[PDB]
From a paper:
The chromosome region maintenance 1 protein ([name]) or [name] ([name]) binds 8–15 residues-long nuclear export signals (NESs) in hundreds of different protein cargoes. [name] sequences are very diverse but each usually has 4–5 hydrophobic residues (often Leu/Val/Ile/Phe/Met; labeled Ф0–5) that bind hydrophobic pockets (labeled P0–P4) in a hydrophobic groove formed by HEAT repeats 11 and 12 of [name] (9–16). Here, eight new structures of [name] bound to diverse NESs show several different and unexpected [name] backbone conformations that share only a common one-turn helix element. All NESs also participate in hydrogen bonding with Lys568 of HsCRM1, and mutagenic/structural analysis identifies Lys568 as a selectivity filter that blocks binding of non-[name] peptides.
Because most previously studied NESs have substantial helical content, we also study five NESs that match class 2 (Ф1XФ2XXФ3XФ4) and class 1b (Ф1XXФ2XXФ3XФ4) patterns, where the hydrophobic residue positions do not suggest an amphipathic helix. Histone deacetylase 5 (HDAC5NES: 1082EAETVSAMALLSVG1095) and [name] (PaxNES: 264RELDELMASLSDFKFMAQ281) have NESs with non-α-helical class 1b pattern (Ф1XXФ2XXФ3XФ4), but the peptides bind according to the class 1a pattern instead. Black dashes show [name]-[name] hydrogen bonds and polar contacts, and unoccupied [name] hydrophobic pockets are labeled. *HDAC5NES and PaxNES sequences match the class 1b pattern, but both peptides bind [name] using Ф residues that match class 1a pattern. (A–E) FMRPNES (light orange), SMAD4NES (salmon), HDACNES (slate), PaxNES (pale cyan) and FMRP-1bNES (deep teal) bound to the ScCRM1 groove. In all (+) NESs, main chain carbonyls of Φ2+1 and Φ3 residues in the 1-turn helix element hydrogen bonds with the ScCRM1 Lys579 (or MmCRM1/HsCRM1 Lys568) side chain, much like niche3/4 motifs where carbonyls of residues i and i + 2 or i + 3 coordinate a cationic group.
Numbering used by the authors:
A (entry chain B): 64 to 68, 78 to 198
B (entry chain A): 9 to 187, 193 to 216
C (entry chain D): 265 to 278
D (entry chain C): -1 to 376, 414 to 441, 457 to 1053
The structure:
Amino acid sequence: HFEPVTMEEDEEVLYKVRAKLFRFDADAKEWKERGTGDCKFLKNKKTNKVRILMRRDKTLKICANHIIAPEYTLKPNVGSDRSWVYACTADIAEGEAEAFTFAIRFGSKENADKFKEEFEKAQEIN
Amino acid sequence: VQFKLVLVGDGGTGKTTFVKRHLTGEFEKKYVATLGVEVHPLVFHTNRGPIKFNVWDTAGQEKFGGLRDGYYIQAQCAIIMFDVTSRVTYKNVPNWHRDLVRVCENIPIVLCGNKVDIKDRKVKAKSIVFHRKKNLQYYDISAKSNYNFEKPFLWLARKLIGDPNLEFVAMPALAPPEVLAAQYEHDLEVAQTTALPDEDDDL
Amino acid sequence: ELDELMASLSDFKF
Amino acid sequence: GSMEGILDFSNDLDIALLDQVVSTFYQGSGVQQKQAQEILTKFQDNPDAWQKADQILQFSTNPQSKFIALSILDKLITRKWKLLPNDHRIGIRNFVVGMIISMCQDDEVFKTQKNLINKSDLTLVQILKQEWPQNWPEFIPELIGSSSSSVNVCENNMIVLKLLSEEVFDFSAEQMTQAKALHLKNSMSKEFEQIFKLCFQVLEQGSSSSLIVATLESLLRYLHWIPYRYIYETNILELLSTKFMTSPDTRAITLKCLTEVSNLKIPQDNDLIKRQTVLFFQNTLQQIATSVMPVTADLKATYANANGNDQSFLQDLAMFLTTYLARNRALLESDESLRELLLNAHQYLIQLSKIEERELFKTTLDYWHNLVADLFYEPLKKHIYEEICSQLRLVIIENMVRPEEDKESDTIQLYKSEREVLVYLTHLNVIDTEEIMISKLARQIDGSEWSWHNINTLSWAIGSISGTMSEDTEKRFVVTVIKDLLGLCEQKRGKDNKAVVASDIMYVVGQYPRFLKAHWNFLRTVILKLFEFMHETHEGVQDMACDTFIKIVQKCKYHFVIQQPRESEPFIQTIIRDIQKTTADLQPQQVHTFYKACGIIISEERSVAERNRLLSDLMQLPNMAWDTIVEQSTANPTLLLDSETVKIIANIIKTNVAVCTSMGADFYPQLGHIYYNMLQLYRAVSSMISAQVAAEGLIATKTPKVRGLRTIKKEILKLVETYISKARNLDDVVKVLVEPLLNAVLEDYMNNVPDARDAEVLNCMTTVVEKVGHMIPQGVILILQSVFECTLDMINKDFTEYPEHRVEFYKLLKVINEKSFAAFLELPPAAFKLFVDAICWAFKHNNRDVEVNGLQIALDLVKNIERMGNVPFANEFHKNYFFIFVSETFFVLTDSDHKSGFSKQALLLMKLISLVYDNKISVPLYQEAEVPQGTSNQVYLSQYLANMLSNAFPHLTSEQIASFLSALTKQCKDLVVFKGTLRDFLVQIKEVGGDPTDYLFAE
Ligand SMILES: Nc1nc2c(ncn2[C@@H]2O[C@H](COP(=O)(O)OP(=O)(O)NP(=O)(O)O)[C@@H](O)[C@H]2O)c(=O)[nH]1
Ligand SMILES: [Mg+2]
């Protein structure tokens, strides 16, 4: 006998899509990029609650993390047929819970539509 | 576990835009000249734990230089920036390097040619050689398209920690909390009718 | 032998 | 706040309050830091702060506070030295000299405050540039004296001398006048014999390692400029290449010194010089092999481990070896006793070339190119390097990078360099190259080196050497490679693996057109497979098929247009018949690439009737879709709000653009089929955009609806622009195309609101003027009237709004100024004045795109006016605008915010000044009143400029201004010297008291 020499593990991926996320700066009246990367709907194995979790390419820093609350509503943006706008009341990407008016844009109108589906599926789930 | 980083280069080359991209993810389209310096903490998560850069984003315009090389005292690393669409900004790289290493005689330094997203490139790859004899790391970068935008900090982190195998890893994602109907409907109205920028981008 | 190559290329399919 | 007290100079400066502000800035954070920061900059910018600096340096205990005090002093020395009472100058000198002596004598201070001492030395060197040697002739002899009394002072004197050498020889071109730089260079040259004596003694006699290092640092600077005798007629090369290569403290600096020695100006007659140059290389390589690592060492692994300073050392070694061998390897190639040294040096380079470091690889690759090019052309040399070249073949094949075809412009440049070297290496030994490549491929079928990376790198390498083999050797090599690549899938299941291999197969085939053109049966099988791939939806396959298709077609088009021996028709007919099937599953932009490829083939048909018939057949589908929707859109204009209809329209026109791109002048018959209905569509779309903007507001321009509509307009303009830029029948352009086009686009542009005007209209007009401007003078006049004033008003309130309109606007004015200057003569005087305003406005842009055209328009305008001779319009032009152009050009020359245009500003200024000193201006530039009758325009020009500069730069003396203008005027035929004088002026306006005799430098 010779002797020889993220906090996502508890969750499940329902939807994954590449997108760009924007944060509306009310005071400055303009949209500001927050991140580009994979947007994931994650289902907790114990609670069965679903959240959006989005990370930036390369640095992998979190740019979105919040429940797909059943009250939220996806609205179109005047300048895009491939984006949704919606209010968010508790996002914890940069620290303590904060509220935002988010916009999320996808590579194609059909990606945007399918996201809307999964978004509302997950809404029912919760 | 923090390190002072000074960022130097001609005015307009994108020093503040590059940092802002790392701080918030936003791309600022306007040129608001930095006055003197702006200090910003910047944390990255690695397989050796978190590393904090205290970024000293200095002014490139002479008339806004402020303390100038006074900002370099006790820096532990640096980025020198120029703009590949402007030859003069590359011609001035040796001047910024001169002033920088006179104060910081032995620090890791990254040379960055920014704005490679612009088609009409003026400083050709083959002309960029200043870094060779000065032992600087060089990267083509674009703060607009994010091309190589993480490389300057990854390389510096490896040099400062002394681990050639250091890698960026995914920060932990705590469970978010489950949680005025007319105050948000006013903000939402404005947000819907403000067009998203760069609507021709692939994303 | 170039005839061999042609036959093999025609049959190369997904 | 409390910290702001130091900003009150009516009280004595509280040193302790200063250190609080300084510490808060350097060690604090957030608001504290940001506030102290604004206070400190406010403090050091006070023009009386320098008077408080001797206090700081005497009484402060904070070295940062002293550093700031030295920066404040440095600003004064550099700009206002000569204005001070001489008492203050001698005083400032004394307490800088003394502060440095005291800091060196305290060994605690000397070792622990290097930043402050280096800052003080630099401050001293600024005084030297002002005062030495004329007012300090004993500085150097007294420096040599003090060196002997203390290692610390001697070490610091090496720092002072290093910095002085830098400021005089390395960084003076920008920062000094020519005369002052020469004065300091000569002064240093005069006293270098004794500087060297000191430096050589320190090196030979050892001592502190910190002292040796500092002396070698200064030596590195001296080598940039000192005569070679100090290097070859002393023992110093021996010291550098032996003694100082053994110690790691001195090794890095010594290697850099030897790299510079490998560049000294050296006579090629002297055999003893030649032998000394061999010897220091022999010693250096010997020290490396015995003290650092042997030739066999794994430098790739060492570099990756990144211990201590290994990475910088290996970079420095690459620079040394490449620099030396590019200049001197012939010294090693004939003497048999030097052969081992020559090959050991290159073996080190082989090992350095395996490191994973892009920029270092580029440095060694540059050298390999130098070598293999010489071995390719120089007799009797290649056999020496056979074993080196064989190893290099493998290195380059294994580290080949992605070519354009299989975005990153650094990679494209590196591939081309790698290809060049590998092509040379293949010519040098074509048999060795084939065998290396064949055997690499066997181990891809092994699985022993199989990987996506490794099969790509090999396929790129195989593709890169096309053209180096004989046709027969190439034939069986190509066949063997494709065979092996095809058999590869018989073991690699899965569509991801099957996609890599396919892409590589088609990449290799695409690189060997000579093979395809000699084997039609095979070329046809290739193409038909690519068509198969165009229905394959795996990511990237379709885009691969299409890029390969158009690449093969560009190279082999003749073989699609002829009828091949055992075929029933030219294969282009077969492609066209099945184009709906072939492309049924592609995305629009891939369809357009397909049609463009067909247009390439069709243009090879030189029988006109056959070419036009092929063209009409190719466009059958888009022409039918086009006919359909021109019937519908015209009967129900609302349909154009249907996004699906808008996209169909855009894709039809994009198809016409793609085909027109490859067919150019031959496209005219197809253009005629759609032309008149296309411009009608342009008008209809335009009305819908306006209606939407009226009903919804400016925000309408951001909606997909209107962006879809504007896409149609832009593509129509691009189609017209594409054809006209390539047309060969300009009579038809003028008689058929231009008039309907201008009627369709110009008024629509003028009468839309700013946010709805398409900058592409300007670009299209630029091409029209370029090609046929000379034939349509009234058309050019109409263009100016429709776009000039309304576009100018968009772009003349700032430098940011409407960026594209800006660029295209000045491209349009430039071409009109070149091709149809008559159109500006017809402008009413108020409009011609806006034109002059618009040019000067271009000067003031920081954007190169605008600035360069602005300066070129100005130059061309002057030439246009000059050509007119002594006529009234030219006379009134100079009366009205000569001095506006002179003064506006001077403003951007001297304001420090337009450095990038210096060369063209200088050219324009020299042209303007030369007009007057050649008496090319026929009327006085002055009024009846302001000057006596008979005064030459020369006298008046110098007078106007003297007054202009006196008011713009009031700190210049009258003598400075007069000397500068006398020189500038004398030199207005010699652009190089003229520019030198402008640079001298830019130096002098940054300080007080510049020497007016500097402007005599040229003579
Ligand atoms: N196309 C492109 N534009 C960029 C890029 N990076 C920055 N810019 C733009 O360049 C301009 C100057 O940006 P900025 O960060 O303020 O430059 P700076 O180096 O901080 N200037 P200063 O030294 O005066 O503070 C901005 O308009 C910015 O949007 C880039 O990567 N690509
Ligand atoms: Mg800035």
